[PDB]
Symmetry: C5
Subunit: 311 residues, 5 copies
Amino acid sequence: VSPPPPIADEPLTVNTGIYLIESYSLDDCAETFKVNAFLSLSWKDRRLAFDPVRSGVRVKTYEPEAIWIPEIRFVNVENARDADVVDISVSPDGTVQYLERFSARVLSPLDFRRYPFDSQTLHIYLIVRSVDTRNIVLAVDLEKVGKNDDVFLTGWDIESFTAVVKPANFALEDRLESKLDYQLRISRQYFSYIPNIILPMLFILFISWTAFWSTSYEANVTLVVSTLIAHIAFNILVETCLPKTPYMTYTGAIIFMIYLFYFVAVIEVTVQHYLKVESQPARAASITRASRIAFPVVFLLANIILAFLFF
Amino acid sequence: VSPPPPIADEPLTVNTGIYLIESYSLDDCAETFKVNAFLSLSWKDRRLAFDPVRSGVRVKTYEPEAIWIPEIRFVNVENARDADVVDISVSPDGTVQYLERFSARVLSPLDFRRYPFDSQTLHIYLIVRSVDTRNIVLAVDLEKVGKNDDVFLTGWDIESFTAVVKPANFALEDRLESKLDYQLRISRQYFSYIPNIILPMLFILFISWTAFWSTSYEANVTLVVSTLIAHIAFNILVETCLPKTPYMTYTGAIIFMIYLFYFVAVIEVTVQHYLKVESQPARAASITRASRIAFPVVFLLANIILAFLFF
Amino acid sequence: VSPPPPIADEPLTVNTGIYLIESYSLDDCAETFKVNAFLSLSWKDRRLAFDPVRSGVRVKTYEPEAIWIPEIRFVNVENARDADVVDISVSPDGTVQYLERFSARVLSPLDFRRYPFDSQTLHIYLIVRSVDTRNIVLAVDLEKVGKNDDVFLTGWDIESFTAVVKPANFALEDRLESKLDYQLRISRQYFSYIPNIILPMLFILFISWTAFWSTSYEANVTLVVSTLIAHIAFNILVETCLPKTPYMTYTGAIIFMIYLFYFVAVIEVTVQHYLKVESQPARAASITRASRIAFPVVFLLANIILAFLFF
Amino acid sequence: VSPPPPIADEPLTVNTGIYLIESYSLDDCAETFKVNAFLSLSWKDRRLAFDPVRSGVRVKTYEPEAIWIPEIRFVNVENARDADVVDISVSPDGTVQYLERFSARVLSPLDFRRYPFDSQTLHIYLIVRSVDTRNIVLAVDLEKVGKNDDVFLTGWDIESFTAVVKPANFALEDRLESKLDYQLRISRQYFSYIPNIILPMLFILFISWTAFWSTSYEANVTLVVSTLIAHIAFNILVETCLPKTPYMTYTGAIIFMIYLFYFVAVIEVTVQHYLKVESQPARAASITRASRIAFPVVFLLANIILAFLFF
Amino acid sequence: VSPPPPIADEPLTVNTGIYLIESYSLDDCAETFKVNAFLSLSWKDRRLAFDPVRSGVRVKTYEPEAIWIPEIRFVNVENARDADVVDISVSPDGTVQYLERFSARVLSPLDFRRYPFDSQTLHIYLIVRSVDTRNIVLAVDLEKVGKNDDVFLTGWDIESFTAVVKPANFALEDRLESKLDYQLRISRQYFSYIPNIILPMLFILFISWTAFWSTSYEANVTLVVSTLIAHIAFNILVETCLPKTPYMTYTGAIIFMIYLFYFVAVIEVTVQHYLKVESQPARAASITRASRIAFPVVFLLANIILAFLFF
């Protein structure tokens, strides 16, 4: 079958709707998430119009093969969605109500700049390509856009699931394409990061600062270098697969700063020891005493600057 | 074919049953589990009623294509179940007995608050969407709900497999849906955690407390900082993929406490050394002697408080 | 088509056979193994009997669709097997010889009590569900049961592949089920564990015992705590995914004992140092000298007890 | 159906086009990348020609089964692409315009010599095998070659997507094959490597050089050997799966050099200590003082030589 | 359809050919490799012979369903190959030329005895099972055996791709089977192992031997035990999944020897210290001085013996 013809020159409007049943496997490294939802479609095909009195039915049911169905696809999917047609209903005016249940792996880029205190807008792009006889345009039926109350994403809070009503109409390979943007707003559950990652990592760093209350070079070397090993080992233990970004991130800057702090602490320990050995204990003592304040103060200040720059 | 019509205006009742053959791959991180089971369905279709005398059989067998079959789906599945129709039997009154064997990956959230001494209620939600001609409602045939004696879940004890008899009837996409809750109760086999994880982790922590019987700062630094490395390395060795939770867990609190204990032990070692160097050995000696009791006592007390708070 | 009718009351016998072509991916953690084999089936259908003289043929070939075929399934599989029908031959008496080549992931529990010196009996359960018209019973063609000479399981020695001749006949959901047990006996290739894992792990433990020939507390702390780190790091290097068991295992008991030994060695080192510092060198010296014998002797004795208890 | 016959003996030209919708999962270790794109095909089949006046239509739509379609395959794919036919349009002269949306895992070798400052040319080879009745030749319609503006590859900058216009025509197994080369030029986003990997790794190496400002052998041993452990642990933390190459790489040479530097630093520390013990402090002091300059200078020089040799 | 009958009693010869298009994913641990190739088949079916004069065409094209095709399978595959029939051509005499493009995961055992300086012969076993009416025998058409010039296996050098011309004919499940051995010879690219793995591992071992130029027990303990940790950590960093073998390997022997060397070095360090403490410095000094030569010499000798035994 071919598409329904226009009465005048008007394009065919396909009313869309996505209703989330399940959301899962939000992969930060791959920048993908899996979705199980309903895809509702609606359009008018006058060739299917009927008189309810003659037919003895108020609604007609069709198999997908029997009638013309617009070819709707997702832009940002890995493989084509796995769909099962649930219902096809035709009303006396020829209004077709199509419903399918689908599952898909969606490719949606994430902004890691504010990780792990980040919020993300996940996108599901619906698209239709126009045909020779007429232009096909997508629309949103807001009453058919939603999500199940039980929908959850492990490690995230689901804020909302909405659609941008105005489609993006553009030309592609000498034909019009009508694209809709469905948006799933999520915010990361940062709570666990505080006791699990940030506080133990700070404790390990604070241990290295005890070298400023000791004049024993052998003990100080062990303190700073062994805590550096503990820091690295701790990071191996708690790491999650974040991808490499062309921009600087909040976490990226802090972690670099922590390495810089271990390095400067070694410098201090090296300088204090050298001055003592080179018969200058007064200088060595004043550098160590200043470090007791300088290290926590510079650390607190730099963190405030970074927090301000990123938030 | 279309659904059987009602005699009066009553909805069609579909008697369901799930019988577990195999259960496997309970993934704590993904919050999924795989199941291999029988799905039994039963309903009345008068169009299929026959007289057993002028036909010649007592029961009639049909191929799925030949008769109308309700479209039953699972809510909390990743992809649609892989099903193989085993039998379709029709009795003289038109009672259809349907049986299929299926395999599915089920998405069911887990509560980690009491891990590894936790119990879980796994859910398998059965659903039917109503049609134009009539409403479809789900029911439970308790004689057809069960599990094979050999059913096992590695690392878990299977308590029971039951169904909540009353379905959840609600509207979705302008039609009625009838949902059943099948519940698989499981409790974690915690035994192995005691010799494999808890006892060695405590031994490593106890090693750090030996620093309270030594006045050697160099030896004490090695004791506390090297045991901290051993603790982290041990945790890398025995770790399992638990997901990030928006709530505090029993294990999460204990592990945080262990890090806090390594930190306070460094403080003590630092304080004891500083007082000795600053010609105050009496204070240093009384702090170390108190720590010998304070550290195991506070550790034992905090654990009792946490165990009480979580259980 | 429906099943062949009985002459008298007798059930239909389906003669089975499994011939192993490939065995692979024995996953200790998942307790699964993959198999590529032939499934041979044989039964008599009198409706298919023919006169070889009139027909001009001694054997007839059929497509699966053309004739009735019993629905055979595997109990302990993850997903239904991937099968390709190879041959269907009918002899003049109506004896049907069916042959398919299949691949399947089999779920079979393993006993880790004696790991890595363990032997396992892998099971492949064949099943048939009876129909309305007649009962279907499974039988074994011990000649049609075997394995290819090239069949190998990496890390294992294949002992035998057989079937328990007597099927398990039982009722399930108001129908009879006939179940056959096919057994694949395997024994673990433990050789590599000796140079790769056991000997280096013992060397690391023996290094800690050198602390009993040293009175230097700083050196002894480094010896025992650094070897504990080496032990953990070594275990990270050589680890394989064994699942958590509700029972104690040979390896589990030994590994726990090794941690206990590192702990007691720290106690000894702590006690020896404390007595020296508290002006009691005679006691400290006799404890260290006794430890030189006590530690290897208790270790050798405990291992003999454990080896006796588990073997 | 069979291919359209030639008027004279001329080959059938199949006009091709690939338009990138999504690009993802560039796996450095596997040397693969996944692509979601449009494959446009065009050829003339005179058997499909029609009169638009009689037909009452200007364009005819066909299902793939209804007409002959050239068997186009990709050379360097893992499995055959998963394709969904979007449109098949036939114009009155018999010109067929075919369009499908496909997803494929492409195998394309990478040059790691300049990693992580490398650029790559990814290839997608289109191929057609000629048939008995006539020869099939591929062509490029440059108007139908492109990529979506939103196309991104995590960790890479997409430079261009083009096709080499001249196909490679050659014989293979007694038939002609027409092959087209589609090229996707990419350059690695190296920015993150500087704060995340190179700078912390240099800091760890610089820490070992502090041993040249210390005469304490015990402290120097800890400095050089513990930093070597920190370096290895750091490399475990930040590693990505690069495959084994038969050639030397820039990163491979630098990392080898870093190990060599830790080794030479141990030699220096060993030599300095030995000379002091063997009553030669003047030699020991001049070796250590020279090392303070020699180690950073040789390191800076060798890096310049390597950077010159590789870039 | 059934197989072509013999003129006299002769078996049916099926001329085979495999042409490699792509080779990838050589998994050392699973002992598998993936292949994308052409499978060419040729046999005579007189029922398909035609008269070129009275028929019109020179060659006839058939769909797989229309004619009898021998059931060819691969022995050592995980799952059945993914095949797409490319061409089926019948010449006037009834000679059928079949061509398909397939992808398969092949299970082929590897010999690790000489790893990483090993060579492997990968096998692809083609098989045909004989039918009731006649025996089917496989043959090799050498003109249809080969590989694409661009065929590569990451980390390996492809030597050749050939077939053993004489098939292996044997009985299996009361029928004849004809098996062909296709061999892909490869040799491992060992180059990268020298700078990446062997040289840094030797440097770490050489560091431990510096303990023979030091009488400081505390420094020597740190040297030998910390280098042992560095060795283990380095091995974690550079490890690749080699499976457990029932035989001793070159790499296995060397790695065991390295652990033994760390153990003997601890013994020496322990003995040297004990003799000094027990007022025997002459013995301690001569043991350390001998060790300076004994350790590198025994290491060099043992390696020569092992290299000779394995190569």
